Design a binder for this molecule. Structure first.
Ligand SMILES: Nc1ncnc2c1ncn2[C@@H]1O[C@H](COP(=O)(O)OP(=O)(O)OP(O)(O)=S)[C@@H](O)[C@H]1O
Lengths: 865, 181, 177
């Protein structure tokens, strides 16, 4: 549909040879070559879409003779063009594809006969094929092109199912329109190398989901179109479909796979540059595995036609076992996840690319670093491409900023334009002249200069975008043009490229060089006008958070370290009482996100507590430490058991038992919180082999799943502890420290109850008895804390305080079990009880702020107001 | 390619050793495979020296004209246009036949390799004519000769194996690469 | 050709002869002139020939077009209509003007490709339909590679353009609807 693509017959008419007898001009169009020999391995040879029941048996001599049998020339260009009956018919030679049943000039096998127009006769006496009319039967095979433009004719490939075959995006690589997203390569190169492997072959992989390393693989494979590779794989290539031939790609089954299966038999035949895109045998097989046009190939693997495919993570295992004989013919490797700098390279790589769309620079550095965060913020999604998601979310946040315009006036449209509404809104009411109620005109005096600046402001992105248009366009089109240089540079072709490429590099780039330098800011922001438009990553990043959990600004705040580095001494503030644990923990803490010793290993404390006491407190505090997250909640139970753990273990079973969660219960959690800490008590009571199930949970607390998953840790953490003590727990005398007593229960219980496991394991920690003073103030701390969360404001105030009940509260404060942690209720109720009455009456929604006068207690509370 | 035995063997050993759970052939078969693997792109022609020295073109290529018109000192533009094209013309040359005569003789390998490829095929087929009974047993089997057909072989790529470029003959190295691979 | 759906605009030929029948009528007229619309015909009111379709703006060709086929000789209900000399009139002219549109079969607007030497009531630029630029050219100008599955709007290229049942947006509340 453009040029040079093909002429099925017509390309062989005068072009089967250059100049010998001057055959290019004769009555038939068959001259330079006639259909090769009497079959189509060439232009319309023998039986073809010319027709099945109508074809030229002697037409080779018949069409090619009137075509050429050439000494009708007088030179190698014996005539202007190659004029003849069919030759001068070249008006209708292209017309061979012109009317119904033919395509454009011609195409496929329909490229063969019809473009020839007159041959064997003009049309007089013979049975030879057909084009747009006589091909009505053959229009299935030699016809069916339906796309005459942008793609090379090349081999016959008549009929077939070509789009809905599959896709070689090497044509989009011809387009280039894909994304040269690179750097994890050797594996491919290996794989590539591994693709060449005889005996068995066809490696297939995968780690993280979904966006198709294939083209990625094709990328170098296009570079192998550029021929990275020895001839074979160099002479192999591939076409992408798995689905689309799916249940729409046929009415119902049975050609469905088959047409394909037949189509296999096309490609199989001395046809280089043929390899088979698959994604997922996952997608294949099934419940009631379909044989999915597939197992047959493991036979038919026999001849030729290697392939590609992808192989998930756990399920790849769930594949692996189905058949190894199946396996036995297709090679298998798998994939790793990049990150950070790896990603940075992408992060590096990409910034143009959706600038190449959305057209926004940012400093982007922190923005990069936002990823890992944002990564760590919703990392279940595929880290880079989720990080890629940010790249959107970025430009999202930008397009946010953008809307119409970037964000200044479309904002200021709130004023300047609504002040330009003030310019003409009131233009006519009852009367507007000089002194009247009609306020219209005055806005026109001011906003002009303002609304003028809109115009640069408009330009500032626009005229920059104007420039930036080309900017994106510039190397883009070089990436066309230097690919159009690269058009053939990989054949050891050179100057055809360099020809246009001469100065084209140092002009575009010079324009770039010219235009890139161009700023026209006052100096507004940086080297530009509106490009970052005024767009701050952090804030988008914030907006990211402001999409994602929000709760920002500490998430603006990160020196995880420094933040922490006080936070101990700070959360000390948060601390209820006993300090060194923190201090201990703090070490571990700092040590923790420090790591720097083991990638694997988290840390746990003996953290010997009292009910609720700090015990819970730790958790939330701890929980409150990492981030605000209260979500972080994790714990166990089935310490009660003998043989149970299924949900309680992770793995459950394989599929086929209660829930397919298989600890997904704990694991979706495990999924949904890379980073946490665990306790569960009864750990004292804990089922021992469960502790052997705990065992691994440790360094090497890495997951196993009923699907075969694996975690790592120190990601999350644990301090799972108990009380289990009494003599110390009850020790009364002594609170902090006191004696090596501490050791006794401590020394014992573990070594008493528990093995060298522990000796591996981390840390050993305790509570301390309570100090009515140290106790005391903790009182309002919660109660202080109370009014706080209240989402409303009137009263919202201090009230009682002093000591009056505090001590009643203390007298009701810690009791040798708790009489402490519960008090909240036991407190609040009273409190609730009180305010209820008042929140009933609410004598003033402000004022309030009293303290209590108050049975044999000489107590029992309430309050005046 | 060529092959050094003992490696393969010894390969198999710890192949087996280092990877038991591929069965006694298999692991080797994998070596056997993977041999060809590390071989494989190693049989890409000069993959580094493919793209490496090729650049000398593109380095000086565009400037063959892009200097022809350029804003520089007058006629020194053409000088740098000339003097690098000089080194583009010249420096190309030292490898310019040279890279082929690798690949040439590599082909000469792959040539003879195809005779290596060839011989057996026939020899197979030659010995399938034993299924032609004793009629075509030795008849064809004589026609295939081999006094020389291998005297061809290991005396042919002999030289280019014999000839070391500087050393090691082919950077193709194509042979067993003892562990390495 | 024209199409499988040619019934409608193609139905008006015997309808043109509907006064009394015809031994045949002629490809000088048909209700496809009016098509489905009571002014200029879909195309030569809007669809194809609205803007550029030359003659028969609204009532131009169709208003008086019926003079040819009106009334029978003796026809209680013997016969209706037939192209006769027009039979092959668009025959090649139906499948010629398509070229390659990314399409399937013969076109009535493809039959609208070349119009006719003279079959019509109108003088514009020729004895052919409307005036000039319409049909295959107008359609090709106005559209391409799209008609209908096996068929389409009766006689004429086709008023059908957008996806049958649309539920408006732009113009939906453009009126505040
Ligand atoms: N090396 C790379 N450099 C830059 N971007 C990359 C790179 N590899 C992948 N990407 C991006 O990630 C997507 C590529 O699809 P992939 O996801 O990498 O293929 P894949 O086989 O599905 O890997 P998964 O399974 O989707 S995570 C595209 O959006 C690319 O922009």
């Amino acid at each position: 549909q453009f040029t040079e693509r093909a002429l099925t017959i017509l390309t062989l008419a005068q072009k089967l040879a250059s100049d010998h007898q001057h055959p290019q001009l004769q009555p038939i169009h068959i001259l330079a070559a006639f259909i090769e020999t009497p079959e189509d391995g060439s232009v319309p040879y023998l039986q073809n879409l010319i027709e099945k029941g109508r074809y030229d048996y002697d037409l080779f001599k018949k069409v090619v003779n009137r075509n050429l049998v050439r000494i009708p020339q007088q030179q190698p260009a014996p005539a202007e063009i190659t004029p003849s009956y069919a030759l001068g018919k070249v008006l209708q030679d292209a017309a061979k594809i012109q009317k119904q049943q033919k395509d454009s000039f011609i195409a496929q096998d329909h490229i063969l006969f019809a473009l020839f127009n007159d041959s064997s006769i003009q049309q007089i006496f013979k049975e030879a094929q057909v084009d747009i009319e006589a091909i009505k039967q053959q229009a299935l095979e030699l016809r069916g092109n339906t796309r005459i433009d942008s793609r090379g004719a090349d081999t016959n490939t008549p009929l077939e199912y070509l789009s809905k075959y599959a896709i070689d995006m090497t044509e989009q690589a011809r387009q280039g329109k894909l994304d040269p997203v690179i750097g994890r390569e050797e594996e491919i190169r290996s794989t590539i190398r591994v693709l060449a492997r005889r005996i068995k072959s066809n490696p297939c992989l995968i780690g993280e989901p979904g966006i198709g390393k294939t083209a990625i693989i094709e990328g170098v494979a296009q570079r192998i179109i550029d021929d990275d590779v020895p001839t074979i794989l160099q002479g192999a290539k591939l076409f992408s479909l798995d689905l689309a031939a799916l249940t729409a790609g046929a009415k119902y089954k049975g050609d469905f796979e088959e047409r394909f299966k037949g189509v296999l038999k096309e490609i199989e035949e001395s046809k280089t540059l043929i390899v088979l895109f698959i994604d997922e045998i996952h997608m294949l097989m099934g419940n009631g595995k379909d044989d999915a046009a597939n197992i047959l190939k493991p036979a038919l693997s026999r001849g030729q036609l290697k392939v590609i495919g992808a192989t998930t993570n756990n399920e790849y295992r769930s594949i692996v076992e189905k058949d190894g004989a199946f396996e036995r013919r297709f090679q298998k490797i798998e994939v790793a996840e990049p990150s950070v700098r790896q990603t940075v390279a992408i992060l590096r790589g990409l910034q143009p690319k959706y600038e190449i769309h959305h057209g926004v620079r940012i400093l982007d550095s922190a923005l990069v670093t936002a990823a890992q965060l944002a990564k760590r913020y919703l990392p279940y999604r595929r880290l880079p491409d989720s990080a890629l998601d940010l790249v959107d979310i970025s430009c999202a946040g930008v397009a946010v900023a953008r809307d119409s315009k970037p964000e200044e006036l479309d904002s200021k449209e709130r004023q300047l334009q609504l002040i330009q509404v003030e310019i003409k809104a009131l233009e006519r009411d009852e009367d507007a002249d000089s002194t009247t109620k009609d306020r219209l005109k005055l806005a026109r005096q001011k906003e002009a200069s303002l609304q003028e600046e809109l115009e640069p402001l408009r330009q500032r992105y626009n005229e920059e975008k104007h420039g930036h248009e080309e900017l994106t366009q510039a190397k883009k089109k070089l990436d066309e043009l230097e690919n159009k240089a690269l058009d053939a540079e990989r054949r050891y072709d050179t100057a055809t490229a360099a020809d246009l490429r001469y100065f084209a590099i140092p002009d575009i780039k010079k324009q770039i060089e010219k235009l890139e330098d161009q700023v026209a800011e006052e100096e507004r922001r940086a080297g530009a006008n509106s490009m970052i438009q005024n767009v701050v990553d952090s804030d988008t990043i914030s907006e990211t958070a402001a999409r994602l959990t929000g709760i920002p600004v500490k998430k603006l705040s990160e020196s995880e370290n420094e933040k922490l580095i006080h936070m101990e001494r700070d959360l000390s503030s948060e601390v209820v009482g006993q300090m060194d644990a923190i201090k201990a923990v703090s070490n571990a803490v700092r040590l923790s996100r420090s790591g720097l010793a083991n990638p694997r290993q988290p840390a746990s404390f003996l953290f010997l507590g009292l009910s609720g006491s700090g015990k819970t407190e730790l958790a939330k505090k701890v929980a409150g430490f990492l981030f605000n997250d209260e979500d972080m909640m994790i714990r166990v139970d089935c310490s009660e058991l003998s043989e149970k753990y299924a949900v309680s273990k992770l793995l459950g079973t394989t599929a086929g038992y209660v829930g397919y969660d298989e600890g997904g219960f704990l694991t979706n959690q495990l999924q949904y919180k890379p980073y946490s800490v665990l306790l569960f008590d009864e750990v004292e009571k804990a089922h021992p082999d469960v502790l052997t199930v705990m065992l691994q949970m440790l360094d090497d607390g890495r997951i196993t799943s009923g699907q075969g998953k694996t975690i790592d840790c120190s990601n999350c953490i644990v301090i799972m502890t108990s009380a289990l003590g009494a003599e110390f727990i009850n020790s009364q005398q002594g609170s902090k420290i006191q004696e090596s007593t501490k050791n006794l229960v401590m020394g014992a219980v573990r070594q008493h109850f528990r093995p060298e496991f522990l000796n591996r394991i981390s840390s050993i920690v305790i509570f301390n008895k309570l100090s009515r003073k140290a106790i005391h103030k903790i009182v309002d701390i919660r109660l202080k804390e109370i009014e706080e969360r209240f989402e409303q404001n009137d009263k919202h105030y201090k009230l009682n305080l002093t000591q009056e009940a505090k001590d009643f509260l203390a007298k009701y404060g810690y009791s040798d079990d708790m009489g402490a942690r519960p008090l909240n209720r036991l407190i609040q109720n009273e409190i609730l009880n009180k305010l209820a009455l008042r929140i009933l009456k609410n004598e003033i929604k402000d004022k309030e702020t009293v303290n209590v006068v108050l049975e044999a207690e000489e107590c029992l509370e309430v309050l005046p107001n």
